[PDB]
């Protein structure tokens, strides 16, 4: 009975891979870390070298600064007691400023403020990391696909906490920092806009999210099925089509009547997924700014 190829039967190690040079400044790349044997049954074993220039350091500082700003506040709520802090961890919440202050930075710390501080720290963390996603690609002379796809995730986020809070004239429309609290905000949002199941963008967003799981289930299983012909070597299979690429295309033509190429399936993949947060971000942006109730809008489309 055949091997399925989810975990390797035999690992193999050699000299730590320091990567391609191209145009990267090697003055920043770290030393190769250890080799996780656990990791190596599934993917690569090498916890090898992370590049870390100036934009990377900016991110990590402010990312931790945001992470700490929220956390020290959770203690202020927990009475500085570790026992409570651990009991009520999901319940704590750093909530936005009250609607009184509108779109100003004049709020007290115990009434907002601390929330703005954290958000600034998060804002700068994400954008610098994005630029880092672009730059890492240019140094290697690769296309900017990863930076475009990341932009679409930024879109949804950028709408939820910035673009849409601005258009309502209030920071209260923003998401609080909390495990159970940000959940409540979400369920709350649907209710106040007359059920988001009626937002035609919401339900398109769902189609793409469902489709992302369906596609990657499809693709992943297909590459595993034709790995016996070295299907995973997708880049070379693009420049020189092997039988792996052929019986992969042919499985699907024979099943559902049409098919992809080895390159084309990845265009399907990046789009299917990228449209989850694109559609979804438009659906939120319209909620409360142009449409007050998605039930009402739905009745008389307009």
């Amino acid at each position: 009975a055949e091997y399925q190829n989810i975990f390797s039967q035999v690992q193999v190690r050699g000299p730590a891979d320091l990567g391609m040079t191209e145009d990267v400044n090697l003055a920043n790349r770290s030393g190769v870390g250890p080799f996780s044997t656990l990791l190596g049954w599934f993917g690569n074993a090498q916890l090898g070298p992370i590049y870390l220039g100036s934009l990377g350091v900016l991110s990590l500082f402010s990312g931790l600064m945001w992470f700490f700003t929220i956390g020290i506040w959770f203690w202020y709520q927990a009475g500085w007691n570790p026992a409570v802090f651990l009991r009520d961890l999901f319940f704590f919440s750093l909530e936005p400023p009250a609607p009184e202050y509108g779109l100003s930075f004049a709020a007290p710390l115990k009434e907002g403020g601390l929330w703005l501080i954290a958000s600034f720290f998060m804002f700068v963390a994400v954008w610098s990391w994005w630029g880092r996603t672009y730059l890492r690609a240019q140094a290697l002379g690769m296309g900017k696909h990863t930076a475009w796809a990341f932009l679409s995730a930024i879109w949804l986020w950028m709408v939820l906490g910035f673009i849409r809070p601005i258009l309502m004239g209030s920071w209260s429309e923003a998401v609080p920092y909390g495990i159970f609290s940000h959940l409540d905000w979400t369920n709350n949002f649907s209710l106040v806009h007359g059920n988001l199941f009626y937002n035609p963008f919401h339900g398109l967003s769902i189609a793409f999210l469902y489709g992302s799981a369906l596609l990657f289930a499809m693709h992943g299983a297909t590459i595993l099925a034709v790995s016996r012909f070295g299907g995973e070597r997708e880049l070379e299979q693009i420049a020189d089509r092997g039988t792996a690429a052929e019986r992969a295309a042919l499985f699907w033509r024979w099943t559902m009547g049409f098919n992809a190429t080895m390159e084309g399936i990845h265009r399907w993949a990046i789009w299917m997924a990228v449209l989850v947060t694109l559609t979804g971000g438009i659906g939120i942006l319209l909620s409360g700014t142009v449409v007050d109730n998605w039930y009402v809008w739905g009745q008389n489309h307009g």
Binding site: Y3, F229, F258, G302
Partner: protein, 240 residues
């Protein structure tokens, strides 16, 4: 209103995207043909895309797709019916001829090279630094077929250097000649390596490489093709 224009605009965008996406996935395989290789009458609603050219990495040249489609090999098959849509039988030995599950494509007869220009796939002996790290080391284990006979023994592991990954087992037959078996088609047991796809007597027939240090893309395809095709054609000798 604003929302109605947004959603209507979206559906038109989506239709352009589906279109573009489908024409992108037509740079191989097309145009469609009849079972005799002549161009089919109906090609469907979508046009062929304007060709694109890949500049390949190590002076290995250029690829333009879509471009002239041909099997640069003969197909040993015959029609079983007077009309479209039926099986085409092997006219010889499907294993030897390379048809059906045993198919290969005529890829380039060079090996794949890594980023720096070196052969991606070495035997481990010629690969410095590389050792079995975890799991049972297969080197030395005898190799068994789907008929419960011994066919050979493992004498090396061919590894992907940049993936750091075992891609083949080099196997010595009673000839004293070796073969490559793909990792993805063998069970490394404790006391042996087992091979379901092939019975012992079919091991000799595995396509051989023309340079004992390296494999070419043409050769991996003939080898992986051969042994995968055995799942169908060696099944009168498969036992359980």
């Amino acid at each position: 209103d604003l929302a109605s224009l947004a959603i209507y605009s979206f559906w038109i965008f989506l239709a352009g995207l589906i279109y573009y996406l489908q024409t992108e996935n037509m740079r191989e395989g097309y145009p469609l043909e009849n079972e005799d290789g002549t161009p089919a009458a109906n090609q469907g609603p979508f046009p062929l895309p304007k060709p694109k050219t890949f500049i390949l990495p190590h002076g290995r040249g250029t690829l333009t797709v879509p471009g002239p489609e041909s099997e640069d090999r003969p197909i040993a098959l015959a029609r079983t019916a007077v009309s479209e849509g039926f099986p085409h039988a092997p006219t010889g030995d499907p294993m030897k001829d390379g048809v059906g599950p045993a198919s290969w494509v005529a890829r380039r007869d060079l090996p794949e090279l890594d980023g720096h220009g070196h052969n991606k796939i070495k035997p481990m002996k010629a690969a410095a630094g590389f050792h079995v790290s975890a799991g049972k080391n297969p080197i030395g284990l005898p190799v068994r077929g789907c008929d419960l006979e011994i066919a050979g023994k493992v004498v090396d592991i061919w590894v992907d250097i940049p993936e750091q990954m075992a891609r083949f087992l080099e196997v010595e037959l009673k000839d004293g000649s070796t073969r490559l078996l793909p990792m993805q088609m063998v069970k490394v047991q404790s006391n042996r390596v087992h091979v379901n796809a092939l019975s012992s007597d079919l091991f000799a027939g595995i396509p051989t490489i023309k340079s004992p240090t390296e494999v070419t893309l043409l050769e991996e395809d003939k080898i992986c093709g051969y042994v995968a095709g055995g799942l169908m054609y060696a099944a009168p000798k498969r036992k359980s």
